[PDB]
Amino acid sequence: QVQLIQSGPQFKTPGASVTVSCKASGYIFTDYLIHWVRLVPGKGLEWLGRINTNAGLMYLSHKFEGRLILRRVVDWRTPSLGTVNMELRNVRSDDSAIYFCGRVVDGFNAAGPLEFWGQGSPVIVSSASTKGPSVFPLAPSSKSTSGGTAALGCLVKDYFPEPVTVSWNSGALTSGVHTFPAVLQSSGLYSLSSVVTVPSSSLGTQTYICNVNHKPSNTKVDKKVEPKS
Amino acid sequence: IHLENVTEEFNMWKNNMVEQMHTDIISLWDQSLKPCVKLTPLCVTLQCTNVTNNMRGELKNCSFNMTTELRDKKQKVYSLFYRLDVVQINSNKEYRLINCNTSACTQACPKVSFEPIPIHYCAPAGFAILKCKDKKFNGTGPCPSVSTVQCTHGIKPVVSTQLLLNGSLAEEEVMIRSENITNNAKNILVQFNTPVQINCTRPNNNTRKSIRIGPGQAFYATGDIIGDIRQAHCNVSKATWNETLGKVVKQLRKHFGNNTIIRFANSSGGDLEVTTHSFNCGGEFFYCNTSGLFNSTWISNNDSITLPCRIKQIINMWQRIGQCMYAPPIQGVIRCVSNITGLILTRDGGSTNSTTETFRPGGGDMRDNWRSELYKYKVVKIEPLGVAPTRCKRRV
Amino acid sequence: IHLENVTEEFNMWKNNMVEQMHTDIISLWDQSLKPCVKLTPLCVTLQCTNVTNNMRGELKNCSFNMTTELRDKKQKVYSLFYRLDVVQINSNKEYRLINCNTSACTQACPKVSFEPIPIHYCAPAGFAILKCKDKKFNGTGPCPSVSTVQCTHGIKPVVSTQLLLNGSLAEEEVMIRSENITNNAKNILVQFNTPVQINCTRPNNNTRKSIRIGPGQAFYATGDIIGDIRQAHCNVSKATWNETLGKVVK
Amino acid sequence: LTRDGGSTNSTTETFRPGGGDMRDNWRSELYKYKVVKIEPLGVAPTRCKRRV
Amino acid sequence: AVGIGAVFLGFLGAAGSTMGAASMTLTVQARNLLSGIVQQQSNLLRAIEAQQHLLKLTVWGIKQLQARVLAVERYLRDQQLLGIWGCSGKLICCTNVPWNSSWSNRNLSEIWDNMTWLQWDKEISNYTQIIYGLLEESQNQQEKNEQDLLALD
Amino acid sequence: DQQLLGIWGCSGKLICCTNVPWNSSWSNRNLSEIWDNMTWLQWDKEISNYTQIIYGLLEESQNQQEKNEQDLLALD
Amino acid sequence: QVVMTQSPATLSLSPGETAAVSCRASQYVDRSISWYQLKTGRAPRLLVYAASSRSIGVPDRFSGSGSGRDFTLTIRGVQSDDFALYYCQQDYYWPVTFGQGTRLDMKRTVAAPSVFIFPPSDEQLKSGTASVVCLLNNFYPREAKVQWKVDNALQSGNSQESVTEQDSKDSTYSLSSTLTLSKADYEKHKVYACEVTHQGLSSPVTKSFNRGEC
Ligand SMILES: *[C@@H]1O[C@H](CO)[C@@H](O[C@@H]2O[C@H](CO)[C@@H](O[C@@H]3O[C@H](CO[C@H]4O[C@H](CO)[C@@H](O)[C@H](O)[C@@H]4O)[C@@H](O)[C@H](O[C@H]4O[C@H](CO)[C@@H](O)[C@H](O)[C@@H]4O[C@H]4O[C@H](CO)[C@@H](O)[C@H](O)[C@@H]4O)[C@@H]3O)[C@H](O)[C@H]2NC(C)=O)[C@H](O)[C@H]1NC(C)=O
Ligand SMILES: *[C@@H]1O[C@H](CO)[C@@H](O[C@@H]2O[C@H](CO)[C@@H](O[C@@H]3O[C@H](CO)[C@@H](O)[C@H](O)[C@@H]3O)[C@H](O)[C@H]2NC(C)=O)[C@H](O)[C@H]1NC(C)=O
Ligand SMILES: *[C@@H]1O[C@H](CO)[C@@H](O[C@@H]2O[C@H](CO)[C@@H](O[C@@H]3O[C@H](CO)[C@@H](O)[C@H](O)[C@@H]3O)[C@H](O)[C@H]2NC(C)=O)[C@H](O)[C@H]1NC(C)=O
Ligand SMILES: *[C@@H]1O[C@H](CO)[C@@H](O[C@@H]2O[C@H](CO)[C@@H](O[C@@H]3O[C@H](CO)[C@@H](O)[C@H](O)[C@@H]3O)[C@H](O)[C@H]2NC(C)=O)[C@H](O)[C@H]1NC(C)=O
Ligand SMILES: *[C@@H]1O[C@H](CO)[C@@H](O[C@@H]2O[C@H](CO)[C@@H](O[C@@H]3O[C@H](CO)[C@@H](O)[C@H](O)[C@@H]3O)[C@H](O)[C@H]2NC(C)=O)[C@H](O)[C@H]1NC(C)=O
Ligand SMILES: *[C@@H]1O[C@H](CO)[C@@H](O[C@@H]2O[C@H](CO)[C@@H](O[C@@H]3O[C@H](CO)[C@@H](O)[C@H](O)[C@@H]3O)[C@H](O)[C@H]2NC(C)=O)[C@H](O)[C@H]1NC(C)=O
Ligand SMILES: *[C@@H]1O[C@H](CO)[C@@H](O[C@@H]2O[C@H](CO)[C@@H](O[C@@H]3O[C@H](CO)[C@@H](O)[C@H](O)[C@@H]3O)[C@H](O)[C@H]2NC(C)=O)[C@H](O)[C@H]1NC(C)=O
Numbered sequence A: 001q002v003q004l005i006q007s008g009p010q011f012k013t014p015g016a017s018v019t020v021s022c023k024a025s026g027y028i029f030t031d032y033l034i035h036w037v038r039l040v041p042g043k044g045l046e047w048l049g050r051i052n053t054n055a056g057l058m059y060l061s062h063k064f065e066g067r068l069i070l071r072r073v074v075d076w077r078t079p080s081l082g083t084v085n086m087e088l089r090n091v092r093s094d095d096s097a098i099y100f101c102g103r104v105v106d107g108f109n110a111a112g113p114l115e116f117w118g119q120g121s122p123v124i125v126s127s128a129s130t131k132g133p134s135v136f137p138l139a140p141s142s143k144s145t146s147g148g149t150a151a152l153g154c155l156v157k158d159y160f161p162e163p164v165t166v167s168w169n170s171g172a173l174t175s176g177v178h179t180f181p182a183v184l185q186s187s188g189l190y191s192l193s194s195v196v197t198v199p200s201s202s203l204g205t206q207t208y209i210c211n212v213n214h215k216p217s218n219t220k221v222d223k224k225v226e227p228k229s
Numbered sequence B: 001i002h003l004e005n006v007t008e009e010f011n012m013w014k015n016n017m018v019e020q021m022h023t024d025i026i027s028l029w030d031q032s033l034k035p036c037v038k039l040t041p042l043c044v045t046l047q048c049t050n051v052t053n054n055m056r057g058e059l060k061n062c063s064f065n066m067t068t069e070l071r072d073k074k075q076k077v078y079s080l081f082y083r084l085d086v087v088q089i090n091s092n093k094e095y096r097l098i099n100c101n102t103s104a105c106t107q108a109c110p111k112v113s114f115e116p117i118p119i120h121y122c123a124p125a126g127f128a129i130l131k132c133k134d135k136k137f138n139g140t141g142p143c144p145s146v147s148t149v150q151c152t153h154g155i156k157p158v159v160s161t162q163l164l165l166n167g168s169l170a171e172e173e174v175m176i177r178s179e180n181i182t183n184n185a186k187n188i189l190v191q192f193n194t195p196v197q198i199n200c201t202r203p204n205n206n207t208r209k210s211i212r213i214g215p216g217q218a219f220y221a222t223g224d225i226i227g228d229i230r231q232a233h234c235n236v237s238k239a240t241w242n243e244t245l246g247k248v249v250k251q252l253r254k255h256f257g258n259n260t261i262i263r264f265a266n267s268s269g270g271d272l273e274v275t276t277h278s279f280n281c282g283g284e285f286f287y288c289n290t291s292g293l294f295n296s297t298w299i300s301n302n303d304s305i306t307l308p309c310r311i312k313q314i315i316n317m318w319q320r321i322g323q324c325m326y327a328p329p330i331q332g333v334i335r336c337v338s339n340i341t342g343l344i345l346t347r348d349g350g351s352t353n354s355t356t357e358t359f360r361p362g363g364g365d366m367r368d369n370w371r372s373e374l375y376k377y378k379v380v381k382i383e384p385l386g387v388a389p390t391r392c393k394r395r396v
Numbered sequence C: 001i002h003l004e005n006v007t008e009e010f011n012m013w014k015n016n017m018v019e020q021m022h023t024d025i026i027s028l029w030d031q032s033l034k035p036c037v038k039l040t041p042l043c044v045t046l047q048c049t050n051v052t053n054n055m056r057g058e059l060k061n062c063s064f065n066m067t068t069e070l071r072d073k074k075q076k077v078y079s080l081f082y083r084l085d086v087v088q089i090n091s092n093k094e095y096r097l098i099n100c101n102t103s104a105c106t107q108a109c110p111k112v113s114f115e116p117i118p119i120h121y122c123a124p125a126g127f128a129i130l131k132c133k134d135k136k137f138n139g140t141g142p143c144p145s146v147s148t149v150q151c152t153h154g155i156k157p158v159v160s161t162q163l164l165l166n167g168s169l170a171e172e173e174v175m176i177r178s179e180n181i182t183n184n185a186k187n188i189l190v191q192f193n194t195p196v197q198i199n200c201t202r203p204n205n206n207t208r209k210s211i212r213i214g215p216g217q218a219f220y221a222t223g224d225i226i227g228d229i230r231q232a233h234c235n236v237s238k239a240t241w242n243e244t245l246g247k248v249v250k
Numbered sequence D: 001l002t003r004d005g006g007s008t009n010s011t012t013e014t015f016r017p018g019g020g021d022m023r024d025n026w027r028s029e030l031y032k033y034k035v036v037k038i039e040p041l042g043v044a045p046t047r048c049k050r051r052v
Numbered sequence E: 001a002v003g004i005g006a007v008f009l010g011f012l013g014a015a016g017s018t019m020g021a022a023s024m025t026l027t028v029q030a031r032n033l034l035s036g037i038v039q040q041q042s043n044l045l046r047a048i049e050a051q052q053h054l055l056k057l058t059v060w061g062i063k064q065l066q067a068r069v070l071a072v073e074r075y076l077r078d079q080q081l082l083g084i085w086g087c088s089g090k091l092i093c094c095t096n097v098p099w100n101s102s103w104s105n106r107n108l109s110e111i112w113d114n115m116t117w118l119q120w121d122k123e124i125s126n127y128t129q130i131i132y133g134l135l136e137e138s139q140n141q142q143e144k145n146e147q148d149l150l151a152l153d
Numbered sequence F: 001d002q003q004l005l006g007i008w009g010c011s012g013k014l015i016c017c018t019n020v021p022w023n024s025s026w027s028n029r030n031l032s033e034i035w036d037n038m039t040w041l042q043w044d045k046e047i048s049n050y051t052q053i054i055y056g057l058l059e060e061s062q063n064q065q066e067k068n069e070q071d072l073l074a075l076d
Numbered sequence G: 001q002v003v004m005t006q007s008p009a010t011l012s013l014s015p016g017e018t019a020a021v022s023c024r025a026s027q028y029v030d031r032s033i034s035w036y037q038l039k040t041g042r043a044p045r046l047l048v049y050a051a052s053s054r055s056i057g058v059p060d061r062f063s064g065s066g067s068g069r070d071f072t073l074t075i076r077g078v079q080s081d082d083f084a085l086y087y088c089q090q091d092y093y094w095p096v097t098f099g100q101g102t103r104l105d106m107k108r109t110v111a112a113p114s115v116f117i118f119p120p121s122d123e124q125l126k127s128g129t130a131s132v133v134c135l136l137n138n139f140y141p142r143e144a145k146v147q148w149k150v151d152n153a154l155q156s157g158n159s160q161e162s163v164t165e166q167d168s169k170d171s172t173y174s175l176s177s178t179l180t181l182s183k184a185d186y187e188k189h190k191v192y193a194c195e196v197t198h199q200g201l202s203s204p205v206t207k208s209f210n211r212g213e214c
């Protein structure tokens, strides 16, 4: 059994210093190099550095020198247990990523094949503060535009942090629903261009309510719609 | 007694008695602190400012309220501390001692010297120690010449991080040992053919002052410095250091494939006690940044290096989180004159296609200081009964 | 090993090893407390009021002054206590802890559990334990079938008053035994033929809070009770309990 | 259980849940063990004699 | 389980068998009287191992060490007491003290063929401190008689 | 050790001859090479297979010998 | 630093077909390529830890291979959870580097997008801002784009685009595109269009309005 446990998700403001911890268990913790790998969303992975859990020394990707520190905590008693802490100093909004703790393959302490991984800690960096969405109807796109499918939606807009939750008719409508994955805009706030598609027999006569909620603010809103011009 | 005609397998990595020695030193250390004064009244809010009469921003001058022997009476009093002893708890800045959120501290009693005496470990009756005699023995394998002895050499319990000193020297050549070498998580221990000699000093003329905390309890403030203040530092002869590394490199080439670019670098990253060479000199704990020593590269072909130091009054040995202890400021000026015996290296993976041989001063637990001296010993149990056939019978 | 043809007098009342168990358990208990924090600074004057979010009057909510780690600094702080932990020292009512006139107290360390592990008692060399094997043995008389053994059962050191639980039970019948029965000042020990199974609960969603008493010393305050406050209680089946008394009466 | 004397008449058996020192919780589990010291020496007569 | 000859391969298993048949098993009690200390020296352990601080619970091990010194010493006293009777090499001795049948009237058959050792104990425990006195003196003079013989030759 | 060396009927001595015959399945080696070639440390590594057999045979060989002597004294 | 190229950008396969994903290094690296499967919301999973050395606990349908400069992860009988991202990773020189990754996509027949547009909501206009939204729905393959036009002259940098996970029912995807302006910038113009580009279409389907109508 080998097991790595990280800290939960975090929000940080620009210029702050962010700490991610990683508890390590089930094997002789001094005898494998731990590595840190960063998953920037949509992009490929990026490698931060590795730490010699015995000697305590660190080795870093040149790009991160001075701006990054890695540390190790251990006891000579209970060698099956230990910890690594990553401190990324002076964060930017473009440091927004998942930070993964990882460990090398057995007998392979000179390279980067990682066998065991922590659950990954999201670190999102913005100047924003807790705010529920505005709800704007994408009121059904009319027969003078849409043809045989009534496309409609709700532009659930300008909120932070995630998550919002969205449904149509409080979940009684699911056919053709697409809660498009949210974009963290240039404003530092999320937006979610949600839609539902239904037959143009039923443009607004059959019920369409977007049901909206935002657990960080605990804000809750709803909105009915009918066809545009 | 030299055991005629013998040959048997030693192993210093799986050797139990290093663990006994490690465990004993901790126990003897604790009892040497046990009767001394617990400093809890000093965990109090300090007004502070920098020292005046001087580069060094390192000395804080601090004033606070302290108990007298009389429970109802307390006194305004002041002392100096190093910047590493204090945290800004906060106009002037305002402070606490570093330990004061996590433990009390014991002040070490002035009468007890720290200095490491020789210790002998002895075999209990019905057991024998064996000693490997072969001067070319690495840390493992069939030693081809052995002696028994009832008790060891006079091993001295020095404590040090990045390099080891006043310890025993191999006679033949520079020796290097590891539990595997190739696996980077293992240390490489290095032991020298000849010592290389270090001078260290703390040139500030210290005046100690006594504060009476309570009815029979005293605390030893840093009272004043007389004359100018100047940095604690250590020196080594550059020629003899350069010679010594020339010899360690010529050994490492045997394992690392001859024509490979071996090089040294400083102890990258983390906190002060992994990044520095740290040792006690006569009652002061030094922390010195060895990058002046470990900064060189080696293709297959009269003056002193100086390295500066920082000092702490509180220390926390063997990373034991609850066990602060406070070392009183020792009087006057001090210096140490010591033999560097050998050093601890850690390897890094292939830096490029060309080299797999960046080395850095290592560390870990203090335990492999004992594994440096206990490298040739083993312990065995006599099994005196035996049965064998011959041609005699008992009669009835 | 069964000691064939053997038969000899056992007496469980005059037995020495019960007194060694009693003395061991007390000593093992004390040393489990000895490394832990002495709670002395909590013996201080308390301002108090009844709890709000509830029948019970059993919980008091109390506020007091306590030292920080820094000797010269102290804080207003508050916690919940039971009406049995506090005494009125006396406008609002004013209190102290119950013990605070007669002794200090040690806080039990959270990492140490009170759960009872099995313990075996073993004979030193040149002595033997004997075990009476007879399933109708009453604790006093010539046992007609015995074994030696080097070391006992896994005895578990539970502690309880009026009735005793998770211990071992005889296979033949309900056993009842006493040093004399007829003399009222002697107990009767009753051992059942079968268990009867108890469920017990504390239905409060309890919240711990940590207070630093000093430099590295902390006290675990009762912080808050979320949801409804409700009584701790135990259940046992009326049918099998009534049946079990029906057997001890016989 | 603990007993009481004749409660008015007929019954001598109002039983009540008892107690005491915790010691008899151990006497519940240790109800069947005993400890003995071995005496390994013995002397007994038979028809055999040693010679000088 | 229950009977003569069966359980003799275990410690004390003979104890209800009659004295004649029990006389074969004497080595088993003799060995287990001391070497049962394996259940002590295999498992007595101190600080760091299983325990950290609580220091009176390391020094609680005085109970276990005190039992060991009593065990070796009580055994060693038998080897002294068996030795001065001129008998230390053996599990059995014939000796030149005559049986005074005042100590028991019971004939040679019924003692070996009927009684168990636990039954015989309860008779001779009246007289044993006479018998040990006679055995000591019977050897004490025999040592001297032998020294005179080795001399007068 | 002194107990174990005692019950084989051997307590007073550094050396004993004893009445157990050597089964050469315990080692096929001849009487010269065992005394003249090997060290005691080499011999241990063979007989450590069979030692618990040989101790059992020594014990029983003595345990009956005590009784045969008691009868030889009893036939007076 | 070592650059890793993968190809293709995405591999499209039916359940039970066989896969071949290429990776290549900017200079020689000696057999020292790992391959990671990445499933969304979970840590990457190690398939191969040097060329052909399969990880313990990995099913034998995966097999790596390669030289000193180019490499190939191979899968036999692609399964319902093999549709994921795959990254090759290099570590012969520090720092460790990774390719851009390859998506594995469940093959299905060509399907053109259905297409829709919305002007900004009346409440959004009254709030002082204007998002013009365009929906492209249930197309296959994944390759789709919006071109945003204002006064029906083509424009750039004024929009964001979001795309669904792969539809498990029918392999399709949907794209939601959003042009956004201040209400003044929205009312400084008079015409709007979203033009749709997709792998299968006859011509770029364009949905449009004059400002204030759909
Ligand atoms: C002393 O210390 C050393 C260093 O730690 C240690 O050596 C290491 O031994 C391990 C043993 O596992 C070597 O690990 C790899 O083993 C697999 C075997 O795969 C099969 O079996 C496993 C069983 O678990 C299955 O998982 C798997 O599916 C297979 O069925 C090999 O495939 C690996 O191959 C690499 O090493 C070969 C050389 O041994 C190379 O030819 C090959 O290219 C592979 O990559 C190496 O070469 C690259 C190019 O030069 C280089 O850049 C890479 O970094 C890599 O070195 C592999 O053998 C492991 O290789 C050993 N470590 C090193 C650094 O080589 C000793 O075991 C230890 N000894 C003692 C007594 O403690
Ligand atoms: C550290 O801080 C302390 C406390 O502020 C300083 O100690 C005080 O220093 C002043 C002068 O700077 C002393 O006052 C002078 O004393 C002489 C005594 O002969 C007298 O002639 C002068 O008229 C004047 O009074 C003062 O006595 C001294 N002590 C206290 C308790 O205030 C100290 O200077 C700082 N620096 C160092 C290196 O300690
Ligand atoms: C040593 O002990 C003394 C006495 O306890 C401490 O001196 C006192 O410190 C306080 C807090 O800084 C001072 O209070 C201030 O007083 C002014 C004027 O009343 C008020 O405007 C401020 O808001 C503040 O309350 C107080 O004047 C001062 N002196 C006395 C006699 O109380 C001292 O801080 C302790 N430490 C040291 C290093 O001396
Ligand atoms: C210390 O010196 C001894 C020799 O005195 C070194 O012993 C060497 O140990 C290695 C294994 O660690 C041996 O390698 C193995 O050899 C067998 C040959 O049958 C082969 O089958 C295995 O694949 C493996 O190669 C090696 O033979 C042995 N001898 C020598 C001269 O190297 C010991 O390793 C040295 N310690 C260190 C830390 O190097
Ligand atoms: C460690 O190495 C350094 C450098 O070799 C040694 O420093 C030298 O120490 C002497 C004695 O203090 C200095 O002489 C004095 O210099 C001052 C300022 O120039 C002058 O006012 C005095 O009259 C006297 O000449 C010497 O300048 C200094 N050398 C250099 C180049 O800094 C140090 O002594 C060594 N010792 C130890 C114990 O580490
Ligand atoms: C190991 O050796 C390296 C190289 O000798 C050390 O790196 C140096 O670290 C110092 C920290 O004081 C850096 O100094 C600073 O420079 C920047 C401006 O570049 C300034 O903003 C800082 O305030 C500070 O003054 C220095 O740049 C850096 N590199 C060099 C060429 O010196 C490293 O500190 C050594 N580590 C240890 C623990 O010995
Ligand atoms: C390594 O070995 C050196 C050399 O022994 C240690 O340094 C010092 O050695 C000298 C001579 O043994 C000590 O001198 C003595 O000092 C006392 C107290 O002042 C005095 O009464 C004696 O007459 C004699 O002069 C000296 O104290 C000691 N230096 C210190 C400050 O400890 C060194 O301690 C050893 N350990 C290390 C880690 O270097």
Ligand SMILES: *[C@@H]1O[C@H](CO)[C@@H](O[C@@H]2O[C@H](CO)[C@@H](O[C@@H]3O[C@H](CO)[C@@H](O)[C@H](O)[C@@H]3O)[C@H](O)[C@H]2NC(C)=O)[C@H](O)[C@H]1NC(C)=O
Pocket: B289, B291, B292, B306, B307, B308
């Ligand atoms: C011991 O550790 C220090 C870092 O803690 C090592 O790095 C040295 O740090 C200093 C201060 O940051 C560097 O100072 C230089 O100052 C000039 C001022 O004009 C500036 O132009 C430079 O950019 C730099 O900041 C110093 O350069 C740096 N050392 C090196 C080798 O560059 C220090 O080296 C360590 N001690 C020894 C004896 O190596």
Ligand SMILES: *[C@@H]1O[C@H](CO)[C@@H](O[C@@H]2O[C@H](CO)[C@@H](O[C@@H]3O[C@H](CO)[C@@H](O)[C@H](O)[C@@H]3O)[C@H](O)[C@H]2NC(C)=O)[C@H](O)[C@H]1NC(C)=O
Pocket: B291, B292, B293, B295, B296
């Ligand atoms: C650590 O090793 C590096 C090389 O790996 C050393 O590099 C350079 O060495 C020189 C002489 O030690 C340094 O001093 C300066 O050199 C220039 C040469 O033009 C001279 O004009 C200056 O007056 C001064 O002597 C130089 O700063 C240094 N440069 C760099 C980039 O490190 C380095 O000195 C070594 N450091 C130590 C503390 O061993």
Ligand SMILES: *[C@@H]1O[C@H](CO)[C@@H](O[C@@H]2O[C@H](CO)[C@@H](O[C@@H]3O[C@H](CO)[C@@H](O)[C@H](O)[C@@H]3O)[C@H](O)[C@H]2NC(C)=O)[C@H](O)[C@H]1NC(C)=O
Pocket: C051, C052, C053, C061, C062, C063, C078, C223, C224, C225
């Ligand atoms: C036990 O007694 C304590 C202390 O009297 C009570 O704690 C205090 O309760 C009040 C409300 O009755 C809290 O004030 C509220 O705080 C929130 C913070 O978000 C604020 O939104 C409200 O407007 C209001 O100010 C107060 O924070 C709390 N703590 C203290 C130190 O006063 C407690 O209610 C009593 N009962 C229990 C079950 O603890």
Ligand SMILES: *[C@@H]1O[C@H](CO)[C@@H](O[C@@H]2O[C@H](CO)[C@@H](O[C@@H]3O[C@H](CO)[C@@H](O)[C@H](O)[C@@H]3O)[C@H](O)[C@H]2NC(C)=O)[C@H](O)[C@H]1NC(C)=O
Pocket: C047, C063, C064, C065, C076
């Ligand atoms: C926590 O510590 C604070 C500060 O020591 C305590 O607050 C103070 O308590 C005293 C005693 O009840 C109050 O004294 C009364 O003041 C009024 C007005 O001056 C006067 O009419 C009364 O005769 C009496 O002297 C005092 O006002 C109060 N506040 C302050 C700022 O001192 C507090 O009692 C402690 N305990 C708790 C649970 O907070």
Ligand SMILES: *[C@@H]1O[C@H](CO)[C@@H](O[C@@H]2O[C@H](CO)[C@@H](O[C@@H]3O[C@H](CO)[C@@H](O)[C@H](O)[C@@H]3O)[C@H](O)[C@H]2NC(C)=O)[C@H](O)[C@H]1NC(C)=O
Pocket: C138, C139, C140, C141, C142, C177, C178, C179, C180, C181
């Ligand atoms: C536990 O069970 C044993 C039998 O296994 C009971 O033994 C009985 O003990 C009583 C005294 O407690 C004996 O009574 C005495 O009998 C003689 C007969 O000669 C008479 O003269 C005395 O006056 C007295 O009555 C009784 O004989 C003995 N045996 C039997 C079979 O009852 C023991 O009493 C039980 N203990 C309890 C508390 O149940």
Ligand SMILES: *[C@@H]1O[C@H](CO)[C@@H](O[C@@H]2O[C@H](CO)[C@@H](O[C@@H]3O[C@H](CO)[C@@H](O)[C@H](O)[C@@H]3O)[C@H](O)[C@H]2NC(C)=O)[C@H](O)[C@H]1NC(C)=O
Pocket: C199, C200, C201, C233, C234, C235
């Ligand atoms: C011990 O015995 C008591 C009585 O049999 C058990 O209490 C009963 O527990 C159930 C389940 O929690 C209660 O049902 C729930 O009641 C609430 C309020 O009416 C309702 O909102 C829920 O939907 C559900 O029906 C039941 O009311 C309660 N009965 C009584 C009379 O209190 C208890 O659970 C037993 N077990 C334990 C471990 O104590």
Ligand SMILES: *[C@@H]1O[C@H](CO)[C@@H](O[C@@H]2O[C@H](CO)[C@@H](O[C@@H]3O[C@H](CO)[C@@H](O)[C@H](O)[C@@H]3O)[C@H](O)[C@H]2NC(C)=O)[C@H](O)[C@H]1NC(C)=O
Pocket: C005, E002, E003, E004, E016, E017, E018, E113, E114
């Ligand atoms: C329980 O112990 C008793 C003695 O206390 C055993 O009873 C009988 O003991 C006699 C000797 O006193 C045995 O007699 C001999 O038996 C053999 C074989 O039958 C025969 O060859 C001899 O001539 C002589 O008669 C007798 O065997 C023995 N058993 C019986 C059933 O009488 C008794 O053996 C022990 N219990 C058990 C279950 O073994």
Ligand SMILES: *[C@@H]1O[C@H](CO)[C@@H](O)[C@H](O)[C@H]1NC(C)=O
Pocket: B049, B050, B057, B058
């Ligand atoms: C030295 O003192 C000045 C004035 O009190 C202060 O601003 C400065 O921060 C101090 N130096 C350091 C290293 O903090």
Ligand SMILES: *[C@@H]1O[C@H](CO)[C@@H](O)[C@H](O)[C@H]1NC(C)=O
Pocket: B242, B243, B246, B296, B297
């Ligand atoms: C001294 O250092 C220089 C530079 O590293 C090197 O050329 C020289 O060979 C060294 N001395 C010896 C004896 O190797």
Ligand SMILES: *[C@@H]1O[C@H](CO)[C@@H](O)[C@H](O)[C@H]1NC(C)=O
Pocket: C049, C050, C057, C058
């Ligand atoms: C409950 O509160 C009232 C008013 O504070 C008090 O008089 C009463 O005694 C309290 N009840 C109990 C049981 O403490």
Ligand SMILES: *[C@@H]1O[C@H](CO)[C@@H](O)[C@H](O)[C@H]1NC(C)=O
Pocket: C242, C243, C246
């Ligand atoms: C159950 O209790 C009732 C009243 O005490 C009693 O009549 C009945 O006999 C009991 N059950 C049994 C099986 O005795």
